[PDB]
Amino acid sequence: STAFTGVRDVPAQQIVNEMKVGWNLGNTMDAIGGETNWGNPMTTHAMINKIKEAGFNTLRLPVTWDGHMGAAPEYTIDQTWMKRVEEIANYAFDNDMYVIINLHHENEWLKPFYANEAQVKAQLTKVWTQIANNFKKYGDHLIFETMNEPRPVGASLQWTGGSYENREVVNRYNLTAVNAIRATGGNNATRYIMVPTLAASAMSTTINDLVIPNNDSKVIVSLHMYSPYFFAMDINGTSSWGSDYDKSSLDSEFDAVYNKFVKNGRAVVIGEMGSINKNNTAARVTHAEYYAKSAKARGLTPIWWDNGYSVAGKAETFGIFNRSNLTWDAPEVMKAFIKGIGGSS
Amino acid sequence: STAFTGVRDVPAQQIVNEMKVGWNLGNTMDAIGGETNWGNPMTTHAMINKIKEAGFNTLRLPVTWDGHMGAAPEYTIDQTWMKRVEEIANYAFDNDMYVIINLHHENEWLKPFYANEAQVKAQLTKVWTQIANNFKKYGDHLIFETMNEPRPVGASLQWTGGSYENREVVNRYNLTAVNAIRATGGNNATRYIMVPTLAASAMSTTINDLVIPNNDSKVIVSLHMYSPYFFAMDINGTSSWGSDYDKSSLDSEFDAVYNKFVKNGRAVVIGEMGSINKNNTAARVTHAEYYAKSAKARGLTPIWWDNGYSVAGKAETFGIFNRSNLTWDAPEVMKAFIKGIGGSS
Amino acid sequence: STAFTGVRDVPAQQIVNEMKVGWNLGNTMDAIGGETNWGNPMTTHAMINKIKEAGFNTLRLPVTWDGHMGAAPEYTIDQTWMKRVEEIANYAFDNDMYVIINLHHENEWLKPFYANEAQVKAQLTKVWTQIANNFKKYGDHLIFETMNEPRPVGASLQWTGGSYENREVVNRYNLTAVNAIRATGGNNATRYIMVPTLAASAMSTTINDLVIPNNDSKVIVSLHMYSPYFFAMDINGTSSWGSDYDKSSLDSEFDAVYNKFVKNGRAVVIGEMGSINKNNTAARVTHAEYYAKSAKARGLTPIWWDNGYSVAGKAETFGIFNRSNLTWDAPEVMKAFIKGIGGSS
Amino acid sequence: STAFTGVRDVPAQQIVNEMKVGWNLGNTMDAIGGETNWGNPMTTHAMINKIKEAGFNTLRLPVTWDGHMGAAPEYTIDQTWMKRVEEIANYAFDNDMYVIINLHHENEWLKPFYANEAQVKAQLTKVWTQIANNFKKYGDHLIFETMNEPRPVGASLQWTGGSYENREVVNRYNLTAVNAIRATGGNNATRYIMVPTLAASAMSTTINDLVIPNNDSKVIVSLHMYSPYFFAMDINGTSSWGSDYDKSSLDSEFDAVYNKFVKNGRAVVIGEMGSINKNNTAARVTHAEYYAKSAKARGLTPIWWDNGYSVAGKAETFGIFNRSNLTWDAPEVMKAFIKGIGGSS
Amino acid sequence: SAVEVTYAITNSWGSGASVNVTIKNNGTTPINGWTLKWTMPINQTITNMWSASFVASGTTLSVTNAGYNGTIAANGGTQSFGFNINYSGVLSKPTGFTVNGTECTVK
Amino acid sequence: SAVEVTYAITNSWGSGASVNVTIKNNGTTPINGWTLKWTMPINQTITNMWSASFVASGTTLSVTNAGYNGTIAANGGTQSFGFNINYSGVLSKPTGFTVNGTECTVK
Amino acid sequence: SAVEVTYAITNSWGSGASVNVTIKNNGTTPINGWTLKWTMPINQTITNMWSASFVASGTTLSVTNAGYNGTIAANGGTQSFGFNINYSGVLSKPTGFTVNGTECTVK
Amino acid sequence: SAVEVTYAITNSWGSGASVNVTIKNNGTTPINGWTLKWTMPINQTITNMWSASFVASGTTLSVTNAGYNGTIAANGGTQSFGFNINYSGVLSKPTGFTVNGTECTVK
Ligand SMILES: OC[C@H]1O[C@@H](O[C@H]2[C@H](O)[C@@H](O)[C@H](O[C@H]3[C@H](O)[C@@H](O)[C@H](O)O[C@@H]3CO)O[C@@H]2CO)[C@H](O)[C@@H](O)[C@@H]1O
Ligand SMILES: OC[C@H]1O[C@@H](O[C@H]2[C@H](O)[C@@H](O)[C@H](O[C@H]3[C@H](O)[C@@H](O)[C@H](O)O[C@@H]3CO)O[C@@H]2CO)[C@H](O)[C@@H](O)[C@@H]1O
Ligand SMILES: OC[C@H]1O[C@@H](O[C@H]2[C@H](O)[C@@H](O)[C@H](O[C@H]3[C@H](O)[C@@H](O)[C@H](O)O[C@@H]3CO)O[C@@H]2CO)[C@H](O)[C@@H](O)[C@@H]1O
Ligand SMILES: OC[C@H]1O[C@@H](O[C@H]2[C@H](O)[C@@H](O)[C@H](O[C@H]3[C@H](O)[C@@H](O)[C@H](O)O[C@@H]3CO)O[C@@H]2CO)[C@H](O)[C@@H](O)[C@@H]1O
Ligand SMILES: OC[C@H]1O[C@@H](O[C@H]2[C@H](O)[C@@H](O)[C@H](O[C@H]3[C@H](O)[C@@H](O)[C@H](O)O[C@@H]3CO)O[C@@H]2CO)[C@H](O)[C@@H](O)[C@@H]1O
Ligand SMILES: OC[C@H]1O[C@@H](O[C@H]2[C@H](O)[C@@H](O)[C@H](O[C@H]3[C@H](O)[C@@H](O)[C@H](O)O[C@@H]3CO)O[C@@H]2CO)[C@H](O)[C@@H](O)[C@@H]1O
């Protein structure tokens, strides 16, 4: 097990390298209303075994805590919920994997505005204090991600960089979250931590305004890059990918991240990416393999968003693993992604 | 007259601030086959007077020299051609304007590959030596732009950042051009010079690979940013502009340039931008004014691409000035653009 | 009291500015064999009151722990000793001062060589765990200084920058010390921490090789600058100070520090400085006032080394406060030092 | 001959590496009152041949121009003097060496004060235009050094960093000199140029305030470092050199330069250094060899100051070559210096 | 608010005045390309501005950095500009200020 | 002179006032660790100062940067600080300033 | 070419060997995120690699930097990585290399 | 050691060979101005060297960086140089190295 291997003092880039390539247990512990509320089966050790066998070395474990905690001032998190997150993490540690645990769909309380700041900070502190306390003994194969995609809600703002206000308050929240984690002491004082830009966007506005809490070298940047948008995400966007223009455009997105962070020693994880199923396997194969090798060439570790929904022709069909069958619903795509990542032997 | 006022030593950013906002004499001296061959009238002093009056302080004067020069080894530029370029520059100097003179459609000889580098450098050297010598007498209101949009040929490559080879060779050509200009001495030793990225693209790949010749502090970056593509350039793209997403996306384009260059003391001119006419005046007005003020907030000076073609509903209809009768074909778009630029009084 | 004010998230430079100017309780808790063992009386609250009243806002409390701790593996520190340190700290907190507590004459065990590294790190961890745990509740007015003047043993090496090995290992120990402190959690995870260069020397060799543990922005650099050597430290050196040369040489020493650290946002405390008594009060007055104002002009906070020994004509006579009398042995030196520091009112 | 080999676009550090190690024709063309007026014989090709044979690859040719020029506006330089300087330079090019030509003892007119700036810049411009024009055809083996040790006049200020005013104005003069050189065009637009800090001092104050004219990448910093002062330069100072402290102190002086300039890609030549004759050959041999290898380990090319005066027990006895005899007055010092430098074969 | 604006009068001459504005960023995030907006009192007109440029639109006055001073550093950083006004009646100061959308404090 | 100092009154309440000072460096060399000196009219006393500290000696006033704002960048860089004064009589302002020994232009 | 690849044998033991590769960039533009491609000689298999990762496809070997060493600086910068191979008989060396599409000189 | 030296054979021809040497710094502190010292095997002479210079004293070799490659960055940074030798007998390699006084691991 990699659960309790202690905490190294290596540069975060080395950790990101070992993380290698990851898979999200999406629409699960992040589902509003509980683990099985969004149509996934209860998660098993056998499922995670398959994820490791495929070539993934990181399990991102997104968790929505809203709905599982009491009121101010303590915001006590339900103990069964906490221990269930821990149980699933150990499925992965048994496989010698890295695990990332975050706060996910917390928009009902985590609001990046000056007017909400004081109260949100208080809640963030209590929430992270409890999570960090529960996982204190775990070594550096456990990575905390302070928040998911903190942003102003409101349809017209969905793909924007928000306001200077929002970006400033997000930076303040990341600091509050990191300090709360570190204040519990032990391995939490030295473990690696991921922090997002506003909306975890890699756009210039948000990556240029990111401030690393305490300038901490143990901090890793968290970005979500479902690129290119129309191919990867839009049920009505093109089902083709692979032209010289496509490749160059994807390279350029990564180059922005390489130049801002990676080449200056600031490590970066793409904690979510992937494509939906437009019944276009050959295109998704070309895209997945190129995404993987292009991202890896910029020092980036990509993590596939798998929400357990893989039906051809429907929106949000990012699922590639069949959890009920323990087989791959999109074997070619998965294999291509892994193949693109390469390896050291 | 900003003809022979000498060459100041101020920060390149101050020059760019003074240039303020510009207008291109497009499809004129850049037109294949001569000044009137692409449907524009012979340029007159009266035309440029109107440009100044509208509030523009910079005339970009694109010139295609291919077709007006002899064979190797001297590549002698036709005296009559050179004299005509100078005559037009002086229409602007009389108005106390900045003038940018470049090499424009030189694609037939200016090729960014290792295989061509030796030939291209010899010619580039001879061409800039002659242009620099002819214009040596003019002060810092005359700016040289070393090349237009150097890139590998091929429609499939048009919106890409080229290969590493292409970007390396473009950096080599910029060095060659700058050295050729500087070597003529006098005012050309201290003149301000614009250099482009590959394709003059603002994409991360190309701006991140730009190398400033000799780290010369008198060098200004030249980018072309017809943003956003679908609205501004694509005859089949949307006719609407002005949502929160629109504003945010454009801001972020400029933010990439601010963070890479401007905030580090490297000045930047957007030598070409604009929108075509899709019978969408109100949208174009909203876009032009927002573009101007957004760009200016990142220290950038935008220059409108005017090719003298303004027919509603056709591609490439960037023209806003009516050269035949000295009125504006798009008065409102022009006024909005200028209004967004603002002023010091 | 400033004992329990909590911990701010401001830049360390602001903390250094508020620290303002300090006084060392020298040859006391740092004395080999006990507080009174080097001729100083037992420290009283009344003594520290005089320090504050003279205008000092920081008490540096050097402590030698060797001799008050058990053997491996626990290296348990005498609890009586620990409580005594805490008690003196509270004399200063009662006066609303900053307090710095270090490890001081630890050279019998703290050896910066690869061969000793594992054992030294083990002892450093245990020692800082205990000190940090004891003071966990204290707010940001309590600063830990990880080591004093760690360096290779030997009289011939005293004023050298050691070897690369020595400097590399010092950096490793600083990280070890900082991690040990932070791992105790609470205010220890967020308090400000000072770390020395090898020998706490400001020489280029050693400041150039300093690595900040985790790049942590809460870390402050600790330097000792008894400059200029001949006048300040050497009983056989000149008794005069005040020429343009003297002023310029001193400025330049501070300029090295400003340029390497302060101007880059890395805060610096000159934790020890001062002059000996060569029956040259006027010169010392001139030196002290200029030192204070020159250091402060570079954002540096200086702390006078006061070993309680003020006898004219003898070596090591840095004492300026008379502890038995509650009066100043060198009132003019003291007053000029304070005067040079200035204030905000 | 290396006289007319044209000009490469290589990094200045490569140029400095090739210069390798140098020797000053001191108290010669820099002498007030004529080439032989300070005790040296008329320079011959034979002498220069011996310099090359010994292993030096750079001749620094200091020239005082004051005393050989008219008054404003033209400050015309005596052509006979100009050609004699050129003749000597060619003795060196015939030996395939580098040559540095400077302005040397110009203190009577070169005054670094706001009040003198306008007039001094006018003279500087006239002086460098003439020198540059005379040597315009020479390739990159000819290097110009803009000024020698510009500083405020006064014995008491000799070893200071001057005032901010002085350092600002020195930076203005360097830009004036560089612009004058570059404005003459041709090889002058691209050759490598050396510029001094105030007083050519390597102290923190002066190296920190150096501003590279136009950020020009072909500019090399010129520093004079007769270190350590007491051994190298002070007739009433120690005659011994070689302790661990001596070596560490020398290393540290070079470390300041390495860290400020060399490691950032800004190349540096120590244009003057050396030791006087205190009848201490063994010590000077130890010092000379260590100086060379330590300097070289930090990318620095050192150049020995030889004023042709080698009398033991006397001040200013830096001479090591016997010009009248074509032998070495200090064969062992010379050989150790060269041995310290090493080689590529 | 973590952003403060200081609007101060450098000099006045009965029919006009010279103003200096200092924007101070006490927040954690640099302001990359500052813009400053306020409501212009009646009876006042900006005659010229330095270190910044402006657009007057109704009673709204929008000021933009000059590029070289575009970034206001976090944790106490400042940037400053100035301008001359002509005025009549009483010389009032603007009441509100917003910087890149954020409401400022008035020092 | 290439160094300009702007001394401006932010607000005044009969018996006291608030001052903002901006120092501008138009020269080629950064000022690394700025200090500002002037002679203060006798009817005035500084009560408190921010972003800087000072030493008052009679009417001689020496102001030193606060570290984080210690460098005034070349080619138009600025740094600013402020303070409150108590005063009687007519409020005057200093008319000459030196920064690190360089006489300034008062704008 | 301005990019040079040095392929050198650190150690060999008849059935296997250890290789060190150094890529040198002599051009003017930094290579931001290097990749290196060559044709794997017959009878050779990479067993493990450090300071880089690879994808073997057919006779094609594609190597990618490890992030911290991703930028090969211009004007003579280098980055290096190494690996072990198994081989049979004659230890052959690749004859050509491509770095980000650019054909290299083998030194 | 936290410093590793890779000494590799680029090419050999029986009486001579080409060597590539890579120094890797796995410690926390950058090596600012590297020097590398070792003992050459007997019957080997260095003919020329690039990207560094040397002083040979018997079989004692002291190599110095070429300035532009003087810093070996911490946490896995490398610098490299190469040289040719003539030799007789078996092509042996050095058994240890010292970098700025620090003993290296031979990889
Ligand atoms: O059908 C089950 C429930 O699905 C909910 O929608 C989720 C999508 O299925 C899921 O793919 C998406 O994942 C997000 C991810 O959480 C976010 O971090 C990332 O930025 O974008 C991904 C793609 O959109 O999350 C959504 C939920 O927010 C339905 O909302 C729910 O009604 C439905 O029962
Ligand atoms: O393709 C040519 C156009 O490129 C534009 O720049 C793009 C950058 O190269 C690209 O890296 C960037 O990518 C963003 C992405 O837009 C955003 O959604 C994501 O979250 O982060 C990515 C990395 O920052 O997008 C920009 C804008 O499209 C030029 O600005 C444009 O002028 C040029 O023609
Ligand atoms: O109708 C006249 C001729 O037009 C030619 O095409 C040009 C467009 O009219 C012109 O607006 C466009 O301008 C370019 C600019 O030169 C380039 O630097 C920038 O990147 O993009 C602008 C928009 O594309 O240039 C094209 C010419 O290259 C027709 O080719 C010609 O047949 C026709 O007679
Ligand atoms: O008073 C008698 C004791 O003095 C001891 O030596 C100390 C000096 O008195 C003391 O002033 C000096 O302070 C050091 C400081 O600790 C160190 O951090 C700094 O670098 O230099 C200062 C000046 O040297 O420390 C020495 C002790 O190390 C004698 O050792 C002791 O025998 C004697 O009784
Ligand atoms: O030796 C310990 C003292 O060192 C002081 O720093 C020295 C620097 O390390 C050293 O590099 C520098 O050297 C200067 C030299 O003084 C100057 O004359 C010459 O022209 O350039 C050299 C390189 O810059 O001198 C400084 C000051 O002596 C520390 O500041 C001091 O605290 C320490 O005890
Ligand atoms: O030979 C007799 C003349 O000597 C003159 O003084 C010079 C010394 O002989 C010479 O060695 C010294 O060199 C300078 C060097 O020019 C300078 O750049 C460097 O910084 O310092 C060196 C000295 O340490 O220059 C002095 C001249 O300035 C006497 O002035 C002259 O009267 C006498 O006849």
PDB file of N, CA and C in Angstrom, chain F residues 40-82:
ATOM      1  N   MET F  40      10.662  71.351   6.802  1.00  0.00           N
ATOM      2  CA  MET F  40       9.230  71.435   7.053  1.00  0.00           C
ATOM      3  C   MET F  40       8.885  72.765   7.713  1.00  0.00           C
ATOM      4  N   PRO F  41       7.886  73.479   7.180  1.00  0.00           N
ATOM      5  CA  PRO F  41       7.475  74.767   7.774  1.00  0.00           C
ATOM      6  C   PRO F  41       7.293  74.631   9.290  1.00  0.00           C
ATOM      7  N   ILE F  42       7.591  75.672  10.074  1.00  0.00           N
ATOM      8  CA  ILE F  42       7.662  75.513  11.537  1.00  0.00           C
ATOM      9  C   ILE F  42       6.309  75.370  12.223  1.00  0.00           C
ATOM     10  N   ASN F  43       5.242  75.712  11.521  1.00  0.00           N
ATOM     11  CA  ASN F  43       3.926  75.626  12.138  1.00  0.00           C
ATOM     12  C   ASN F  43       3.316  74.225  12.043  1.00  0.00           C
ATOM     13  N   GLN F  44       4.123  73.240  11.652  1.00  0.00           N
ATOM     14  CA  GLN F  44       3.606  71.912  11.328  1.00  0.00           C
ATOM     15  C   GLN F  44       4.351  70.771  12.012  1.00  0.00           C
ATOM     16  N   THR F  45       3.595  69.785  12.479  1.00  0.00           N
ATOM     17  CA  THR F  45       4.168  68.593  13.097  1.00  0.00           C
ATOM     18  C   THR F  45       3.523  67.346  12.507  1.00  0.00           C
ATOM     19  N   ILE F  46       4.345  66.375  12.126  1.00  0.00           N
ATOM     20  CA  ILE F  46       3.822  65.108  11.644  1.00  0.00           C
ATOM     21  C   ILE F  46       3.363  64.274  12.826  1.00  0.00           C
ATOM     22  N   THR F  47       2.106  63.851  12.796  1.00  0.00           N
ATOM     23  CA  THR F  47       1.552  63.055  13.875  1.00  0.00           C
ATOM     24  C   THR F  47       1.660  61.557  13.601  1.00  0.00           C
ATOM     25  N   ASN F  48       1.389  61.145  12.366  1.00  0.00           N
ATOM     26  CA  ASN F  48       1.615  59.758  11.979  1.00  0.00           C
ATOM     27  C   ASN F  48       1.811  59.565  10.471  1.00  0.00           C
ATOM     28  N   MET F  49       2.537  58.511  10.110  1.00  0.00           N
ATOM     29  CA  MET F  49       2.951  58.274   8.732  1.00  0.00           C
ATOM     30  C   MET F  49       2.758  56.801   8.352  1.00  0.00           C
ATOM     31  N   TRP F  50       2.355  56.554   7.108  1.00  0.00           N
ATOM     32  CA  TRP F  50       2.195  55.189   6.606  1.00  0.00           C
ATOM     33  C   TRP F  50       2.972  54.963   5.310  1.00  0.00           C
ATOM     34  N   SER F  51       3.448  53.730   5.127  1.00  0.00           N
ATOM     35  CA  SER F  51       4.211  53.333   3.941  1.00  0.00           C
ATOM     36  C   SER F  51       5.607  53.934   3.933  1.00  0.00           C
ATOM     37  N   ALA F  52       5.996  54.481   5.078  1.00  0.00           N
ATOM     38  CA  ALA F  52       7.295  55.105   5.257  1.00  0.00           C
ATOM     39  C   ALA F  52       7.450  55.386   6.742  1.00  0.00           C
ATOM     40  N   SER F  53       8.679  55.631   7.173  1.00  0.00           N
ATOM     41  CA  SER F  53       8.946  56.085   8.531  1.00  0.00           C
ATOM     42  C   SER F  53       9.808  57.332   8.394  1.00  0.00           C
ATOM     43  N   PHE F  54       9.922  58.102   9.468  1.00  0.00           N
ATOM     44  CA  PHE F  54      10.665  59.349   9.391  1.00  0.00           C
ATOM     45  C   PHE F  54      11.464  59.664  10.646  1.00  0.00           C
ATOM     46  N   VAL F  55      12.474  60.504  10.464  1.00  0.00           N
ATOM     47  CA  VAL F  55      13.215  61.090  11.566  1.00  0.00           C
ATOM     48  C   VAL F  55      13.052  62.605  11.451  1.00  0.00           C
ATOM     49  N   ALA F  56      12.438  63.221  12.457  1.00  0.00           N
ATOM     50  CA  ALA F  56      12.285  64.677  12.476  1.00  0.00           C
ATOM     51  C   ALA F  56      13.317  65.291  13.407  1.00  0.00           C
ATOM     52  N   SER F  57      14.141  66.173  12.858  1.00  0.00           N
ATOM     53  CA  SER F  57      15.165  66.850  13.632  1.00  0.00           C
ATOM     54  C   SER F  57      15.012  68.364  13.457  1.00  0.00           C
ATOM     55  N   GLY F  58      14.335  69.004  14.402  1.00  0.00           N
ATOM     56  CA  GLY F  58      13.946  70.387  14.218  1.00  0.00           C
ATOM     57  C   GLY F  58      12.991  70.448  13.039  1.00  0.00           C
ATOM     58  N   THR F  59      13.363  71.183  12.000  1.00  0.00           N
ATOM     59  CA  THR F  59      12.525  71.246  10.808  1.00  0.00           C
ATOM     60  C   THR F  59      13.037  70.315   9.710  1.00  0.00           C
ATOM     61  N   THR F  60      14.177  69.679   9.942  1.00  0.00           N
ATOM     62  CA  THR F  60      14.698  68.742   8.966  1.00  0.00           C
ATOM     63  C   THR F  60      13.912  67.449   9.072  1.00  0.00           C
ATOM     64  N   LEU F  61      13.391  67.000   7.941  1.00  0.00           N
ATOM     65  CA  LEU F  61      12.578  65.798   7.903  1.00  0.00           C
ATOM     66  C   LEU F  61      13.199  64.784   6.958  1.00  0.00           C
ATOM     67  N   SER F  62      13.493  63.594   7.471  1.00  0.00           N
ATOM     68  CA  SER F  62      14.070  62.542   6.649  1.00  0.00           C
ATOM     69  C   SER F  62      13.132  61.354   6.623  1.00  0.00           C
ATOM     70  N   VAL F  63      12.667  61.016   5.429  1.00  0.00           N
ATOM     71  CA  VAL F  63      11.704  59.945   5.257  1.00  0.00           C
ATOM     72  C   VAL F  63      12.387  58.768   4.569  1.00  0.00           C
ATOM     73  N   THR F  64      12.132  57.573   5.071  1.00  0.00           N
ATOM     74  CA  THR F  64      12.750  56.382   4.544  1.00  0.00           C
ATOM     75  C   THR F  64      11.635  55.429   4.112  1.00  0.00           C
ATOM     76  N   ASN F  65      11.867  54.715   3.018  1.00  0.00           N
ATOM     77  CA  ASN F  65      10.927  53.721   2.511  1.00  0.00           C
ATOM     78  C   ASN F  65      10.615  52.617   3.528  1.00  0.00           C
ATOM     79  N   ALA F  66       9.571  51.845   3.251  1.00  0.00           N
ATOM     80  CA  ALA F  66       9.145  50.761   4.131  1.00  0.00           C
ATOM     81  C   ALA F  66       9.565  49.372   3.613  1.00  0.00           C
ATOM     82  N   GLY F  67      10.617  49.320   2.804  1.00  0.00           N
ATOM     83  CA  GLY F  67      11.158  48.037   2.372  1.00  0.00           C
ATOM     84  C   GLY F  67      10.488  47.474   1.131  1.00  0.00           C
ATOM     85  N   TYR F  68       9.207  47.119   1.243  1.00  0.00           N
ATOM     86  CA  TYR F  68       8.448  46.593   0.101  1.00  0.00           C
ATOM     87  C   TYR F  68       8.295  47.611  -1.025  1.00  0.00           C
ATOM     88  N   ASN F  69       8.417  48.897  -0.696  1.00  0.00           N
ATOM     89  CA  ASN F  69       8.333  49.953  -1.699  1.00  0.00           C
ATOM     90  C   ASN F  69       9.671  50.697  -1.851  1.00  0.00           C
ATOM     91  N   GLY F  70      10.777  49.987  -1.631  1.00  0.00           N
ATOM     92  CA  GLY F  70      12.081  50.613  -1.538  1.00  0.00           C
ATOM     93  C   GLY F  70      12.705  51.007  -2.859  1.00  0.00           C
ATOM     94  N   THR F  71      12.270  50.399  -3.953  1.00  0.00           N
ATOM     95  CA  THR F  71      12.857  50.692  -5.246  1.00  0.00           C
ATOM     96  C   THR F  71      11.932  51.563  -6.088  1.00  0.00           C
ATOM     97  N   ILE F  72      12.436  52.709  -6.527  1.00  0.00           N
ATOM     98  CA  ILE F  72      11.704  53.504  -7.484  1.00  0.00           C
ATOM     99  C   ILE F  72      12.272  53.191  -8.858  1.00  0.00           C
ATOM    100  N   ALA F  73      11.493  52.468  -9.654  1.00  0.00           N
ATOM    101  CA  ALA F  73      11.932  52.036 -10.974  1.00  0.00           C
ATOM    102  C   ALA F  73      12.293  53.194 -11.897  1.00  0.00           C
ATOM    103  N   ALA F  74      13.222  52.922 -12.803  1.00  0.00           N
ATOM    104  CA  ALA F  74      13.657  53.902 -13.785  1.00  0.00           C
ATOM    105  C   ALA F  74      12.548  54.241 -14.784  1.00  0.00           C
ATOM    106  N   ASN F  75      12.773  55.284 -15.573  1.00  0.00           N
ATOM    107  CA  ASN F  75      11.904  55.593 -16.695  1.00  0.00           C
ATOM    108  C   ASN F  75      10.440  55.796 -16.311  1.00  0.00           C
ATOM    109  N   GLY F  76      10.200  56.441 -15.179  1.00  0.00           N
ATOM    110  CA  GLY F  76       8.851  56.845 -14.825  1.00  0.00           C
ATOM    111  C   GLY F  76       8.253  56.064 -13.677  1.00  0.00           C
ATOM    112  N   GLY F  77       9.067  55.261 -13.001  1.00  0.00           N
ATOM    113  CA  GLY F  77       8.574  54.531 -11.848  1.00  0.00           C
ATOM    114  C   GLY F  77       8.177  55.479 -10.726  1.00  0.00           C
ATOM    115  N   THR F  78       7.181  55.088  -9.943  1.00  0.00           N
ATOM    116  CA  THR F  78       6.814  55.858  -8.757  1.00  0.00           C
ATOM    117  C   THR F  78       6.740  55.009  -7.488  1.00  0.00           C
ATOM    118  N   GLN F  79       6.842  55.689  -6.354  1.00  0.00           N
ATOM    119  CA  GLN F  79       6.441  55.145  -5.060  1.00  0.00           C
ATOM    120  C   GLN F  79       5.793  56.302  -4.305  1.00  0.00           C
ATOM    121  N   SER F  80       4.904  55.985  -3.370  1.00  0.00           N
ATOM    122  CA  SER F  80       4.142  56.998  -2.656  1.00  0.00           C
ATOM    123  C   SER F  80       4.039  56.647  -1.183  1.00  0.00           C
ATOM    124  N   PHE F  81       3.791  57.658  -0.361  1.00  0.00           N
ATOM    125  CA  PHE F  81       3.508  57.436   1.052  1.00  0.00           C
ATOM    126  C   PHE F  81       2.640  58.581   1.531  1.00  0.00           C
ATOM    127  N   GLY F  82       2.132  58.490   2.754  1.00  0.00           N
ATOM    128  CA  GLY F  82       1.295  59.563   3.267  1.00  0.00           C
ATOM    129  C   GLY F  82       1.483  59.798   4.746  1.00  0.00           C
TER     130      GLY F  82
END
